[PDB]
Write a protein that holds these residues in place. Sequence first.
Motif, PDB file in Angstrom:
ATOM      1  N   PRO A  39       0.815  -1.201   0.000  1.00 11.21           N
ATOM      2  CA  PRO A  39       0.000   0.000   0.000  1.00 11.21           C
ATOM      3  C   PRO A  39       0.853   1.256   0.000  1.00 11.21           C
ATOM      4  CG  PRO A  39       0.174  -0.831   2.224  1.00 11.21           C
ATOM      5  CD  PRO A  39       0.868  -1.835   1.336  1.00 11.21           C
ATOM      6  N   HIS A  80       1.598  -1.636   5.780  1.00 10.68           N
ATOM      7  CA  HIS A  80       1.781  -3.077   5.769  1.00 10.68           C
ATOM      8  C   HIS A  80       2.920  -3.537   6.666  1.00 10.68           C
ATOM      9  CE1 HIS A  80       4.529  -1.357   2.981  1.00 10.68           C
ATOM     10  NE2 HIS A  80       5.073  -2.523   2.656  1.00 10.68           N
ATOM     11  N   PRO A 124       5.061  -3.181  10.319  1.00  9.84           N
ATOM     12  CA  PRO A 124       5.098  -2.724  11.696  1.00  9.84           C
ATOM     13  C   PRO A 124       6.253  -1.785  12.018  1.00  9.84           C
ATOM     14  CG  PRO A 124       5.620  -5.065  11.563  1.00  9.84           C
ATOM     15  CD  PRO A 124       5.059  -4.665  10.229  1.00  9.84           C
ATOM     16  N   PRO A 153       0.991  -5.535  12.958  1.00 11.89           N
ATOM     17  CA  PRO A 153       1.273  -6.899  12.499  1.00 11.89           C
ATOM     18  C   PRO A 153       2.512  -7.419  13.220  1.00 11.89           C
ATOM     19  CG  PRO A 153       0.884  -5.403  10.639  1.00 11.89           C
ATOM     20  CD  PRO A 153       0.983  -4.542  11.864  1.00 11.89           C
ATOM     21  N   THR A 154       2.497  -8.639  13.750  1.00 15.85           N
ATOM     22  CA  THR A 154       3.679  -9.173  14.430  1.00 15.85           C
ATOM     23  C   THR A 154       4.718  -9.461  13.346  1.00 15.85           C
ATOM     24  OG1 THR A 154       2.837 -11.457  14.413  1.00 15.85           O
ATOM     25  CG2 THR A 154       2.637 -10.249  16.494  1.00 15.85           C
ATOM     26  N   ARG A 191     -18.918  -4.671  15.661  1.00 15.97           N
ATOM     27  CA  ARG A 191     -18.509  -4.632  14.280  1.00 15.97           C
ATOM     28  C   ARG A 191     -17.099  -4.065  14.273  1.00 15.97           C
ATOM     29  NH1 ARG A 191     -17.826   0.709  13.118  1.00 15.97           N
ATOM     30  NH2 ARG A 191     -19.445   2.137  13.742  1.00 15.97           N
ATOM     31  N   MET A 192     -16.406  -4.130  13.156  1.00 15.18           N
ATOM     32  CA  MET A 192     -15.072  -3.554  13.028  1.00 15.18           C
ATOM     33  C   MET A 192     -15.161  -2.132  12.499  1.00 15.18           C
ATOM     34  SD  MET A 192     -12.807  -5.751  14.186  1.00 15.18           S
ATOM     35  CE  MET A 192     -11.243  -5.369  13.423  1.00 15.18           C
ATOM     36  N   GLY A 193     -14.056  -1.407  12.385  1.00 20.70           N
ATOM     37  CA  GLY A 193     -14.103  -0.049  11.862  1.00 20.70           C
ATOM     38  C   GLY A 193     -13.784   0.943  12.960  1.00 20.70           C
ATOM     39  N   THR A 245     -14.181  -7.771  17.416  1.00 19.37           N
ATOM     40  CA  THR A 245     -15.575  -7.783  17.876  1.00 19.37           C
ATOM     41  C   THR A 245     -15.715  -8.568  19.172  1.00 19.37           C
ATOM     42  OG1 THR A 245     -16.010  -9.730  16.486  1.00 19.37           O
ATOM     43  CG2 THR A 245     -16.348  -7.592  15.518  1.00 19.37           C
ATOM     44  N   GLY A 260     -15.271 -12.114  18.297  1.00 17.30           N
ATOM     45  CA  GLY A 260     -13.939 -12.328  17.766  1.00 17.30           C
ATOM     46  C   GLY A 260     -12.829 -12.375  18.790  1.00 17.30           C
ATOM     47  N   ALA A 261     -12.948 -11.631  19.893  1.00 13.91           N
ATOM     48  CA  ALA A 261     -11.933 -11.642  20.944  1.00 13.91           C
ATOM     49  C   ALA A 261     -12.664 -11.826  22.283  1.00 13.91           C
ATOM     50  CB  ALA A 261     -11.071 -10.387  20.952  1.00 13.91           C
ATOM     51  N   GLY A 317     -26.712  -9.731  22.389  1.00 14.33           N
ATOM     52  CA  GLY A 317     -26.420 -11.005  23.016  1.00 14.33           C
ATOM     53  C   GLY A 317     -24.950 -11.266  23.302  1.00 14.33           C
ATOM     54  N   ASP A 318     -24.075 -10.938  22.360  1.00 15.90           N
ATOM     55  CA  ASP A 318     -22.636 -11.090  22.457  1.00 15.90           C
ATOM     56  C   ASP A 318     -22.051 -10.203  23.551  1.00 15.90           C
ATOM     57  OD1 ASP A 318     -21.904 -11.528  18.839  1.00 15.90           O
ATOM     58  OD2 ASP A 318     -22.465 -13.040  20.243  1.00 15.90           O
ATOM     59  N   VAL A 375      -5.282  -8.046  10.398  1.00 20.46           N
ATOM     60  CA  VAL A 375      -4.682  -6.899  11.029  1.00 20.46           C
ATOM     61  C   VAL A 375      -4.533  -5.696  10.123  1.00 20.46           C
ATOM     62  CG1 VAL A 375      -2.569  -6.130  12.163  1.00 20.46           C
ATOM     63  CG2 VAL A 375      -3.488  -8.386  12.682  1.00 20.46           C
ATOM     64  N   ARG A 376      -4.121  -5.860   8.880  1.00 22.99           N
ATOM     65  CA  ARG A 376      -3.880  -4.712   8.014  1.00 22.99           C
ATOM     66  C   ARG A 376      -5.207  -4.423   7.315  1.00 22.99           C
ATOM     67  NH1 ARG A 376       0.139  -8.302   7.729  1.00 22.99           N
ATOM     68  NH2 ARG A 376       2.367  -7.589   7.757  1.00 22.99           N
ATOM     69  N   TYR A 413      -6.173  -2.370   4.845  1.00 25.83           N
ATOM     70  CA  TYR A 413      -6.211  -2.278   3.397  1.00 25.83           C
ATOM     71  C   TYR A 413      -6.459  -3.640   2.752  1.00 25.83           C
ATOM     72  CZ  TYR A 413      -1.466  -4.172   2.942  1.00 25.83           C
ATOM     73  OH  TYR A 413      -0.421  -5.069   2.909  1.00 25.83           O
ATOM     74  N   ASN A 467     -20.283  -4.901   8.077  1.00 26.53           N
ATOM     75  CA  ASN A 467     -19.764  -5.516   9.304  1.00 26.53           C
ATOM     76  C   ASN A 467     -18.319  -5.096   9.544  1.00 26.53           C
ATOM     77  OD1 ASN A 467     -22.168  -7.041   9.977  1.00 26.53           O
ATOM     78  ND2 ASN A 467     -21.460  -8.714   8.663  1.00 26.53           N
ATOM     79  N   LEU A 468     -17.587  -4.606   8.553  1.00 27.66           N
ATOM     80  CA  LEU A 468     -16.219  -4.184   8.763  1.00 27.66           C
ATOM     81  C   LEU A 468     -16.097  -2.686   8.930  1.00 27.66           C
ATOM     82  CD1 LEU A 468     -14.532  -6.362   5.996  1.00 27.66           C
ATOM     83  CD2 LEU A 468     -14.629  -6.792   8.491  1.00 27.66           C
ATOM     84  N   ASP A 471     -30.088 -13.866  18.194  1.00 29.01           N
ATOM     85  CA  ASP A 471     -29.046 -12.889  18.489  1.00 29.01           C
ATOM     86  C   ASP A 471     -29.205 -12.036  19.728  1.00 29.01           C
ATOM     87  OD1 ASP A 471     -28.549 -12.958  15.099  1.00 29.01           O
ATOM     88  OD2 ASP A 471     -26.964 -13.410  16.588  1.00 29.01           O
ATOM     89  N   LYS A 472     -30.293 -12.181  20.462  1.00 30.15           N
ATOM     90  CA  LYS A 472     -30.422 -11.444  21.717  1.00 30.15           C
ATOM     91  C   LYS A 472     -29.954 -12.398  22.813  1.00 30.15           C
ATOM     92  CE  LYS A 472     -32.396 -12.292  24.783  1.00 30.15           C
ATOM     93  NZ  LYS A 472     -32.875 -12.436  26.191  1.00 30.15           N
ATOM     94  N   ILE A 473     -30.350 -13.673  22.709  1.00 27.44           N
ATOM     95  CA  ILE A 473     -29.909 -14.617  23.727  1.00 27.44           C
ATOM     96  C   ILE A 473     -28.380 -14.615  23.823  1.00 27.44           C
ATOM     97  CG2 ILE A 473     -31.784 -16.232  24.137  1.00 27.44           C
ATOM     98  CD1 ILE A 473     -28.969 -17.406  21.912  1.00 27.44           C
ATOM     99  N   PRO A 474     -27.930 -14.266  25.017  1.00 29.55           N
ATOM    100  CA  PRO A 474     -26.506 -14.288  25.335  1.00 29.55           C
ATOM    101  C   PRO A 474     -26.145 -15.751  25.581  1.00 29.55           C
ATOM    102  CG  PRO A 474     -27.780 -13.054  26.997  1.00 29.55           C
ATOM    103  CD  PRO A 474     -28.732 -13.919  26.216  1.00 29.55           C
TER     104      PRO A 474
END
Lengths: 727, 727
Positions: A5, A10, A12, A23-24, A610-612, A627, A630-631, A653-654, B509-510, B512, B535-536, B723-726
Amino acid sequence: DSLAPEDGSHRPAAEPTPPGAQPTAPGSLKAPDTRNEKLNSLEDVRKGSENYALTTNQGVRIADDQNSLRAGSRGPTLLEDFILREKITHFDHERIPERIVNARGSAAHGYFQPYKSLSDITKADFLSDPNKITPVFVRFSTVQGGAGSADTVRDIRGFATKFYTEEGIFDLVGNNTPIFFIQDAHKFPDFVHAVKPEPHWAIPQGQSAHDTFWDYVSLQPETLHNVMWAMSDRGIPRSYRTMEGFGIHTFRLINAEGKATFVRFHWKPLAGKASLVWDEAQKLTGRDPDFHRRELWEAIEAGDFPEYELGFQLIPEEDEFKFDFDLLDPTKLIPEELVPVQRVGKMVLNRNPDNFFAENEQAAFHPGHIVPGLDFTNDPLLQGRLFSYTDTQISRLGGPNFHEIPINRPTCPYHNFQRDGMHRMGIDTNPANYEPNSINDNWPRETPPGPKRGGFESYQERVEGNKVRERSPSFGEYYSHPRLFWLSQTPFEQRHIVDGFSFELSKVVRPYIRERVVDQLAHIDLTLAQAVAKNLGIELTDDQLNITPPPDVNGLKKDPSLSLYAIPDGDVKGRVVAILLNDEVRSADLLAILKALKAKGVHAKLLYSRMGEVTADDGTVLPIAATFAGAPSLTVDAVIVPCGNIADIADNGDANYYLMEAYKHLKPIALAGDARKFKATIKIADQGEEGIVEADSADGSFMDELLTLMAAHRVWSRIPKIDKIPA
Amino acid sequence: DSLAPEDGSHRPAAEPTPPGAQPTAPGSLKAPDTRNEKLNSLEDVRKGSENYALTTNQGVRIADDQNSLRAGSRGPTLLEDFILREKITHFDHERIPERIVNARGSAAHGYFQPYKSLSDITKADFLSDPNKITPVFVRFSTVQGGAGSADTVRDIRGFATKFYTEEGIFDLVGNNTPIFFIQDAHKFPDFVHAVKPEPHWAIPQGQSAHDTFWDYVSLQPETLHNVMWAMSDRGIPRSYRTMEGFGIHTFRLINAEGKATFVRFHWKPLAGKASLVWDEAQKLTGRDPDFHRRELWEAIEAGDFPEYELGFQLIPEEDEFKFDFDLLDPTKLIPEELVPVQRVGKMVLNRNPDNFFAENEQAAFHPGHIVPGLDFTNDPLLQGRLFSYTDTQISRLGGPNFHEIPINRPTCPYHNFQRDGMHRMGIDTNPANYEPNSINDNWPRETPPGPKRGGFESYQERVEGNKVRERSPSFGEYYSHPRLFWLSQTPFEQRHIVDGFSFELSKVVRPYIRERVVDQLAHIDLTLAQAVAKNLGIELTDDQLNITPPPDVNGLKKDPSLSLYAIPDGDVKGRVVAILLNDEVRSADLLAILKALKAKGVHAKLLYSRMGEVTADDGTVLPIAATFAGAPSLTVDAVIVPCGNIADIADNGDANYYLMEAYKHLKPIALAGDARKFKATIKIADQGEEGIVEADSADGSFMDELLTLMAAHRVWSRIPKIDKIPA
Ligand code: HEM
Ligand code: HEM
């Protein structure tokens, strides 16, 4: 093609950064200045990449790496395409056999440094000068599972340290529990086959919860000591940085005067002792099977270097027989209330590898790799280990010259009359390939033993007896150490142990095996036996209930160094907290949370549905790490929920589940302002409760309360409360 | 010596038994009477054990297998202990390199049988006679993970079948999706490196959700069709019995008159198509990482034999260029709406192996292993596969005589002039080791090709073009099959696709790279692209919103055979229901449950909060298979809660959580009498809800409702309520 890019994003930053931030990357790209003599000597084999032309192995430049050579673009592939042939050929031969045991491991480079000269008791060069640094390479591991299994299984952990000293490689190959399962190396293959996946179907992976392990254990009571340790929380550490390390066997220190001393090797985690809880550990094998590997790596990239204190238990030659147990019996520990651990030095792990395959997977450790100043003992398990390792390593690594693989080499080149063998890299020029010789004036030459830089001489221990295949009668005692272990644990540790045995015996299909394990537990402690029995729907007989308990170990009723938690040794630097965001976070709370965390070296990860990005009340744009799903909470040490538009996430819920899983797993939870609406999710009284930090805002006080809970690692007082919530 | 229990309960019964009923065992012990010519020919190397003396490998009886030989019971181990050295030596050399790809695999024995003679289109002997059977050996696998990785990850599945024919071994080495990620074998090492663990730290295991994978995909759009399959629920099959199989490449069928016909091979699962949902599959990698392995093994021990129908897509040579895609491109599928799958035969897997290592781990499959009546095509991926396999197997298995390892040998002895090599088992007596020879009158001899039993002759395809490293321009289309795949999925399958991409790109992680993948999706379908982008936290640009969709595939707007579920194909035989016990079960309900389940061939697992036994209201003693936590809802297809003392489990956290997890995973739940009170746990309206069977008691209608629901596999209509139920 110039695919990167235009922005440099890209790659670290070559500076210490927090986990998840960049990025590791390979160690020497990440921390170019972290150096030591062994790491410096590896520079001749490191290879660059940037700005080079793509070539074959023979140096021929490649024009088209997208296509095979064929007769027509839709025609048959031609045998003459040597470029395709070399590429596929190398790929077809990438894999090597994994270690028989401890195939799953993670490793790092670092250094060791003694606090004071130990010249009075050992002539080992690496222990003689506190201004002297010995480079090290450490590999931590699990035991049973393959190279591709999960990190957070229940199991013993290996802890191997290679010391590149000035008088040779010294490998200290130990574990995270002070004893082993078996006494004589002759039974290593029976024990390991029993714990490994069963032979007809290769199930189960990374688990001792199966019939063969428990059959073996039930028939070989010498195993109960190390089984207690594995059934406890010791079996599922929070991280490689937060567990103890032990050489296990009794070895010898030998000074310049020839005096021999007995020693047991210890490693004390400077980050303190800490483990997960079973449900958390099991689930974590699903959500992130690489959790320990990642955590170790990210800890090093963040600058939270794993630090350990090398310590010695020392036993004069004249006190050899002064204990209840045989000093040379590896199923027996030496209680620190009897023989204290003396601080010796410090080991810091401050650089990751560059290539896991090249450095970690090909690394070879051996307990027989000792240096002048050290010596063995007749421990029968150690004695038989002295034969394995080299044997297995040639099979695994391809040849007898595996000591020439870069990671394995001494810092000073060796000289001897050994020649050839597969993949010989050194080109010998000595006219003589034998000794004694006159054509090279006998070089290289033997070196008498001496105080410094002398040749290796074994301690002249007296040997007396007949040639027998016999177990020493002093090794025939199996229940008193398991009992000492049991009594030294806290009450929540005892229950965890009960649940470990209960869970595992429940996966044993044959009922009689379960009953026999229960019978053996009734020889250790009646209270342990009844609680496991009860969980298996078993009632002890009157006879079992009258079994007289084993004797104390040298009059001890308990020894607190054997508990993970009886004596607080908490440390939060390097822990990580999850911060559940909403779409309008009060930035005042976030500023206060993050700065407080950061002051104590605690990491944070900004989580959302969500991400972003999300934008805080004052317009601060907050980037999202991951998210909720996700984690998961399994991956963090604590959760903080800031005030904001809580209605954005209160019905997610999450989001709710995240707090229920964390509450279930005894982790500190902190709720700010309207975040306190989540109290209902985890059934917290209006009043509040110990382990839940709550306030109108995330001030200074709020963060200090949270950090104190983090210092005690988990909220043990919450145990009875978790039983009921469905999570 | 008396170690076995008195009752004989240590050893399983030699008859079909449901999963978990008895301990699993070697297939020849479990099913002695199940035979075939391959299974019988393994009798020369099968070994027994009962009643034999323990001996060395040289046949010397061992007296003491517990101790090393030492000088005095507490002295040092002696070099002369050869029993100990052999034992340790063989253990040190146990491991062999795992497969470069597809290292994680589960296998079984069975037979294949053609429905009718296929002699007008092929002279292959295994397809010539409906009353003649061919022994097979099948190995199913994941692609990315090592041998010790988990089964239910997201990944493609391999499906390899070894047909032991009368005219040679034919290996049909396929996958569970009709296309592969790449077009030229040249890129294989590139594609496998990107999906495999990252080279510096070797993370992550068995997952594509990392930067290098998505980096490769974003720069190589030819990967998008198989990425679509991987991200849908095809990527996480419920069982190896419930997935399709495909050879992917176009190959050739050649008849006795020499006519060639192009063919694609298919396998149809007679147990129907089914898959897990992502949260379930990922969680299942922690609770039971050997789930697919176990389920296959137990299904075969139960008598629920995995059965597949072999099918063929046939395209006459004159129709080679009639599609709008190239027939030889392996990123392209041939829609069943254009070329139907014709039924060819049935394959049944009815016997597990005796030793996983000896037969599963040493098995060797090769797509180059064809027989007369079959031939290849110029598919560039298939062609470069013929430079591989043999190669890797020699390093993996140890030498060029790997064809002599029992599991790999053809049924009839082979004869040729090849000699020597490591571990040569055959002892040749041919006076001649070359041909032509006159000293053995030229035997063994070449045999001309013919209709039956003739020598191999390649089809005489015309070859025309210049020697080039060039991609055929007809392969240059990447978006229309992806879009055709997408449009053929049900709405809930499309949501699942959206979520797989969202989940995976969020671990990249990246940012782009995330953005580049989104931009590629916008060339496939805007709705899909938009859903992933949202979602992203990404915004599609105006340009991205105006990309014209790619063309239809030969006028198709969809093809329903590409969907797992659009066309009902449900089979409950072999599925499994969890029955949550209480300590006073209404035997009347239990009876009704088990009789109805039995009639449809559905198994049951009795669960409780502890192990051991519970007694029903009529005195029936019911042994417990596992606890609620120990065998989670993840592992079953549906849940049944019978009446009894519901108060015993009503406030049980694990019991309540069992239903919440099952509910979340769209599994059918049945509640009888007072069990209906758990309806509050999963917030279900008083009236009722499609997917929850309820009634005063478990009856005829109760079970029919439940079984009808299980035939539809999951309760897709519940998606909006979860999706509400945890959970
Ligand atoms: C006190 C008992 C023992 C301890 C603490 C121990 C520790 C370890 C550790 C930590 C490793 C992994 C090193 C690495 O990361 O590469 C390992 C590997 C190994 N162990 Fe030991 N072990 C013990 C007993 C034994 C015995 C009795 C034998 C057999 C005679 C044995 C044979 C092996 C072998 C063959 C390997 C693989 C080494 C390689 O492939 O390089 N171990 N052990
Ligand atoms: C249509 C594309 C492909 C399919 C369907 C496929 C399928 C498979 C399967 C199912 C296996 C595992 C066999 C077993 O269970 O033992 C396998 C192994 C393997 N594949 Fe392929 N593969 C494909 C492409 C390739 C390519 C392009 C290459 C290299 C040019 C390749 C090289 C290998 C190798 C080296 C192995 C390991 C074999 C062994 O160690 O015995 N594959 N493949």
